[PDB]
Amino acid sequence: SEEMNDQMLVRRQKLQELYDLGIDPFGSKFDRSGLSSDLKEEWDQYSKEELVEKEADSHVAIAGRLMTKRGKGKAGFAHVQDLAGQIQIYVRKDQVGDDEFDLWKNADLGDIVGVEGVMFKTNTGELSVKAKKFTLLTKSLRPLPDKDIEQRYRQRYLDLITNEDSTRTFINRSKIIQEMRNYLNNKGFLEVETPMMHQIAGGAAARPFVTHHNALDATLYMRIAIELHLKRLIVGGLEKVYEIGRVFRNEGVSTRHNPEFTMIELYEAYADYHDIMDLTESMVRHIANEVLGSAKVQYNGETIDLESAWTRLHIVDAVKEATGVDFYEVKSDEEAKALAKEHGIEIKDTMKYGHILNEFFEQKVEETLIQPTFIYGHPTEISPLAKKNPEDPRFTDRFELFIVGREHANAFTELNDPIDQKGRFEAQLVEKAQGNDEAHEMDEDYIEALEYGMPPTGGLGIGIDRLVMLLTDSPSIRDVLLFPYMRQ
């Protein structure tokens, strides 16, 4: 724009003027007595007349961004924004002196300023700081935008200045994650760090990001999951371990998806998937109560009840409820393919009984699960790391947590049998050769670890970003990431 270029030229002139006046226009350190909220908590109780008597005791020092400005004469007003919010400042020439009032006149919207002064109230009752000393801490060379929908994601720093609701989401994200640590640390779980660069990327059904080590001439994959390294630590005897960190998945383009995202994975020796259900339900309920004050949370104008007991439903029973098809009584792959055609379930011809049952669930059931629901009993074909159910080997002791129509957690009784696990890994190569590009690879070192003996173990994975979305009432993953991935 022509107007935008003229504003930036004026700001460059004003920068040079500050150099001519003999100050550092990008500032030195600045001591502060408090934030705007501390000033309001301590002084807003008192009236205009009471504050005049307390001027000897109300000396403060604040700093922040100039958001409003008025007064072309010898007295002027402005709103200064810091982390907590805004506070009005009052700058008189007869208070700050001639040299500092030239800096006040130079100052424009967006500049960082420091103010030392005393508290007072205007005739309208607005708590303000009467400046005794004014400091221009940083000259901004570019003005803020006033009144592009993608700018808040591409330039998050502008969103954090202009939108207070955005800042609250990220503060609550930090509290949610820290409350998860505190909960698990109090129960005896050890936080660990495992490699993000894997020789073989396993632990999930997803396409990896590939990279190259130059000095070694070696191919490395960014991790798609934290699973396989954490189960090695269970073989090593650590018993209770977890890890909160980034995973990377090279999947298709979507507003619902991000190439990198934060996961917690957790493993407890001598537990099963029912113990993990209890832990997941208790932990999420606890985090909601501590951060929000209630486990009944609003999501898109609807009350999601995490306080009351969460529903537990077998995937076969969920599909039967929705479609009338009872997959217990389906006896072959051909019968499943026939039923898939009848009920309009999009499938691939390579799919079997278990794959098709899952498509019934994903296409007809999944989205209806608004209240927190543990869907369990996932078929063996889609569950390569989960132990089989003893009473019915078609299904595994696995669950997925569904809230607001989407997956929030994945968990199972772990497969500690290295013979079966070798067999699962072999069957995933059959799928990979015939057109399933996001299938499990052959990790020989992992099988070797299981052969030394892994105890019976319960494992859990929670998508942290989706949990944060739920508890902050955010419609998209781009609202809970500070710098979400944007095209170009």
Add this chain to the structure above:
Amino acid sequence: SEEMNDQMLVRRQKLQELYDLGIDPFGSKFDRSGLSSDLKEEWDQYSKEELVEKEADSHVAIAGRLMTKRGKGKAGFAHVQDLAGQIQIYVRKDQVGDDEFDLWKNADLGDIVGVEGVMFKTNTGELSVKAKKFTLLTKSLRPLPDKDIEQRYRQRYLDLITNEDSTRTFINRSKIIQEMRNYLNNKGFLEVETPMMHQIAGGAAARPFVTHHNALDATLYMRIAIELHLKRLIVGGLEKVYEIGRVFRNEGVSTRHNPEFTMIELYEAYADYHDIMDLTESMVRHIANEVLGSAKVQYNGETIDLESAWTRLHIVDAVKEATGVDFYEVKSDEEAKALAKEHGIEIKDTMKYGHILNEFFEQKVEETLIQPTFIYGHPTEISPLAKKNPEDPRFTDRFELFIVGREHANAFTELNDPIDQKGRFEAQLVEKAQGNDEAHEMDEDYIEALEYGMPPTGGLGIGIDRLVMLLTDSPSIRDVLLFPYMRQ
């Protein structure tokens, strides 16, 4: 080996025998009353005779790995290892019954077992569990190795079972990191997450790992630092932010280096590098006192004194002390190159005054800094993101922390001037074109962020793995990583 293959065949026979006996040889969930240390804390005070009277009150349930075994008759002993340590078990046929004693006979070293029983002591005074119920929880198909130096790194799970000192290092690593969070959270710092996949990898002098997004046909770089995204949050008004996470550097091969490692980066608005010195010194001293009980720590048989005041030394004065060369009085690049030849300092012909001063420091001084030393005043040529010193523009307001002869932290008064920062970025392209492959790229979005106005800011980066090495008395980075990078 032939013997190793025979052992594994015997274990497969024993696995099949357990299936024939009608148990699950890979186990179900197992409730425990405590760890071996809880049993010792509660019961080891009492004598053999006192424990017999308390058998009604001393029912316990434990589980762990079978590490020793003796007794071929109807009574046998074994040591069971859990997270805390080992406890002896005593299994009699007349206590557990015939069916469970067959499982005891089947059990071999490395198997996971569950024992429910009562406390007692042997004639030698060893606290033990007299088994009332024995459970074989997992059959191990491969025996542990007895009495290859790289096996502890390649197979960490074996090291954690056999070496108790290794387990303590990783528990203390977790405490060190959590104590850092607690310290910073109490001072008002916000923990955040920023992208690990960058469009342009900046924030340090290092070669990046390159990768490709398939669905978008876009090139992405794994982050070499956390710096540039965190300073955007300071522009956004968050004031106090930090991030503990992985960075990735595609550098040469070494035992001292790992391709991925953990960093904390921290940024405080309205602070300078002297405030960051105070913070770094206070924080590290605090973490040492809380985790170890003292800030005087042993490293390779030598007392490193973090309790007393840390030394502060200008890089020019450090070089003058070591070599006699005063770089304040060196007036040109040719004089610096001449002095470099005289004192045997390996340099490149493209290097200037500042580059050469640093080589003097790295080759003659660095390794001698055993006690904690803030080296400051780094020259502008090697400090592209640091603000210049006002009194002497040759040097920046930067420091590096040196302990036990190596770098532990990097910090500076941040360059919030977008005109100068553009100029630094332009001068790094001059170095990149003439043979400096680990130089800074041209981030236009970052410059645009600074133009909206960044306040005066102090920034800090600490290598977490090196800090953990110091405080755990570990000689190599591979000793403080659970799964360090190994060739092949």
